[PDB]
Amino acid sequence: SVIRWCTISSPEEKKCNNLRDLTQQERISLTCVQKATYLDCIKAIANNEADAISLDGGQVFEAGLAPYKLKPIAAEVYEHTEGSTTSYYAVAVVKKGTEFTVNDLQGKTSCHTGLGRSAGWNIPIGTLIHRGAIEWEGIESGSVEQAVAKFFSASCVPGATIEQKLCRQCKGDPKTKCARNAPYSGYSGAFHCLKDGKGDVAFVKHTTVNENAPDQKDEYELLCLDGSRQPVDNYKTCNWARVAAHAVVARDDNKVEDIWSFLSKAQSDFGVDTKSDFHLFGPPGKKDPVLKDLLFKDSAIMLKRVPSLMDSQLYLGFEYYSAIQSMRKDQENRIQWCAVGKDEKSKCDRWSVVSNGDVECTVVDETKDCIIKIMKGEADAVALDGGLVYTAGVCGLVPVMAERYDDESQCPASYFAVAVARKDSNVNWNNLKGKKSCHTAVGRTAGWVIPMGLIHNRTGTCNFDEYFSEGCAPGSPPNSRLCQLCQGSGGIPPEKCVASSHEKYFGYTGALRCLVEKGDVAFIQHSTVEENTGGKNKADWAKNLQMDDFELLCTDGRRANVMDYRECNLAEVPTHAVVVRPEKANKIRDLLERQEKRFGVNGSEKSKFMMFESQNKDLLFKDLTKCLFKVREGTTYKEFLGDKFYTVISSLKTCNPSDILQMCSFLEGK
Ligand SMILES: [Al+3]
Ligand SMILES: [Al+3]
Missing domain, CATH: 3.40.190.10 (Periplasmic binding protein-like II)
Incomplete structure (x- = not known):
């Protein structure tokens, strides 16, 4: 394996060749290609004539545009009192x-x-x-x-x-x-x-x-x-x-690993603290400016891998990216809502019609895609479970309106995460290992963060795929055991274990079904059994379910009636909230407030559409929602979630942070 580096000056070519000589015996070798300008290099790389080149953010932007679509895989790191970062x-x-x-x-x-x-x-x-x-x-x-x-x-x-x-x-x-x-x-x-x-x-x-x-x-x-x-x-x-720091960009293919391995080893050998005559970075200091910033900036002290979910637009950030775009363009009262799955998109399309267009809709396959779309500005808002509000927060989005479940005239607020099991059994919170579990979705408060964070905290383990014999936790790796009980859409393609309503066992109600049909325990909210019994759910599987057919598992190991969740719950947690980019908070609260007046539980036009109702699937908003309450301007995600929940999810995310969390952490400096 050989990495073809593209240089844009004779001095760079000379340094590159010098590096080539110093790594000829390495597992991954280096080759040098000199071009007239960085753009010829971007073209060469896209054309499979070269493999990488370090670019200033303004050029990372150019390189990421079609038809090149190159992506940032390594970012320079500069010294900072606060802590050396990639900016x-x-x-x-x-x-x-x-x-x-x-x-x-x-x-x-x-x-x-x-x-x-x-x-x-x-x-x-x-x-x-x-x-x-x-x-x-x-x-x-x-x-x-x-x-x-x-x-x-x-x-x-x-x-x-x-x-x-x-x-x-x-x-x-x-x-x-x-x-x-x-x-x-x-x-x-x-x-x-x-x-x-x-x-x-x-x-x-x-x-x-x-x-x-x-x-x-x-x-x-x-x-x-x-x-x-x-x-x-x-x-x-x-x-x-x-x-954002200058970054090495390359084709979005398999060769990225080898490019990084080369750099990683190159900087270990000739990094900033090397005693060698050759410095990958500079070294910085007085000398002919024509000999400075060759290949990498003299001020870089190290290269840092960029999370794979990152593209040039996300790498540069909304403000800078928007500034560049504005200088290439010329010369609002509608909310661009993000819907996950076909079901949410249908309810949203209907909302668009009755709102006469004040609300528009964009579809994506997974919730994480909504976070990304809002970060870019392609979408304006989305309601997220507290667990995702956290990730959205790390990504720079803030909660502006939150769901309330008690009384509609009450718009603190919360719900309870509970463990539900079949009434007739020995299953308890202490013999759960090796059992079949059912989760709303990985990353969500009741279905994952609370239960798993509780187990991780007490046990110290992170290997959750082996704690339960098997189970269904939408969003998990397709071939993982936490996907074995999932059912997909029952159509084609299967879409098994997908984190959307397309997965039969997705969500609070989805996890209850999984419990009735295949599991030993379901991790849902305090109202789930309530919402699906008493004939309130006319689905074949639940049309005859009874409240007394279930019981709650308390932490102390005992069990209780599903109605005593206040005395037997895994935790009292923050409610779901609508997150947006900070600058959009003002518009989204206003537009969302006018919408609820027309389509809330007491909407003046509730006969035309109801924001808080769906076929037992919490589409767009939880079905339990009685009203949305305004989240004071400037409230951070940590303040909204509460220190208790924040501490839980903060620790748990050290286990296996998702691609999007890793991506946003990078953006934050972690
Ligand atoms: Al620069
Ligand atoms: Al929830």
Whole structure:
């Protein structure tokens, strides 16, 4: 196995070949391919001519677009007091004593790392446009380069292809001084452009001055957004943005592992603390800027694997991604709801019709897809079980409206997680090992987090697939034993163990059925037996079920009547809630509030549609819901869930965090 690395300059090619020589005997070898620009590299990689290249976030964006669709597999790590993470700070450095502020940039000369790059372009230009300093309303007001050439008197923007003015301050030969790999390119080139007097300001990163003139830091200052000027070491409190680290992108195929193994071993051997003559990263320090940031930035102290569920859009984040897109586009009162499965989509489509369109619908196969869609902005909201509200929270979404189950006029609030078993049996909370279990779904409060967290806490084990002989816990690996009792849709394809209403044993009611049809214990909520007895459920399996046919399993090992859940429950837990992106909270609460007035349990038009009712399947909202109560603005997911639940799920997630949780933890720095 050989990794074909794509370089975009002769110096990079030289370093790459140097690394090739140093790893010729390794299990995974290295090959070097030099191209004219990073874009030729993106194309080469997509075309299976090369395998990887490290890119600035602005280029990670380009590489992730169709038809390339490359993905970030490794991210640079930079030193941080708070803790080295995979992000850096874009700063605007000027020479001390020049007095002008961020508000006086019009008419000044500027130095940039390169066109389309985070710190050197996307951040500074996007910011000046946002503040209105650079007049640009969108694509129809002309190109961004034209608006920038009109703003700054002259600049050096490696890679600029429309405005000659943006190359005017660049150093070098007439035909190549404006190339993306020219003398004044990169964070270090842009800095020297400033140092040489060719720019009044250089848009670089927080380590730049230290990398090029540590002993002369005192001759520079940072331009803060509030108009102030501060010392270069104050970047944490005087920066224009915190942006995702440069990352190695590659095709979304099997070769990603070998690419990572090569890097992992390469950095173990020539990492930041290596005594070797060869440094994978830099090392940082004074030297010809043309020799800096080769292959990887000199400021990187390590590479970190990027969770597989990550794509370029998620990697960059909604705000930055949206900023880039806005500079490529021109020139609301409807909620884009996320429905999991065909059943939820049908109820949602119906809601769309009676809401006259105030609510729109998007379908996905799994709940986790809703979290991803909302993170990207493709969808606006979704109701999630507390367990998922946690994951959604780690992902940056917040709970804005929550379900209440007691009285509709009551909109604290909660429900109880219980263990249900057949009345006539010895099954108890202490002899559960080796038994058949039924779970609403993995990751959910009552069906998984509470029961399993309780077992993990007391036992210390994480191997849950072997604790129960077998059972059904939707969302588990298809061939796992916790999927053996699941039934799928009964159609084709089977869709067995899928975490949606398509799975016969999915949800609170689904797990009860599984108990009646195949299990020894069901992990549901306090009202589940109630909701499906007394003929309230006309399904063949439950049309004749009786409340007294079941019993609750208390933690002490004893058993009780299903109506004494308050004295025999695994835990009292936070209710399900509607999560959204913070900026959307305002609109979603308002639109959701007007909807409940028309279609709530006492809706003025409840005869047309009822938000809180479904065929015993908790579609979109729990069937138990009596009303939604507003979650105070600014409430974090931890505050909403309560410290008790938070502590439980926090610990349990150390066992086997899902792909999405790992992905969002990465985004959070973990
Ligand atoms: Al950068
Ligand atoms: Al629940």
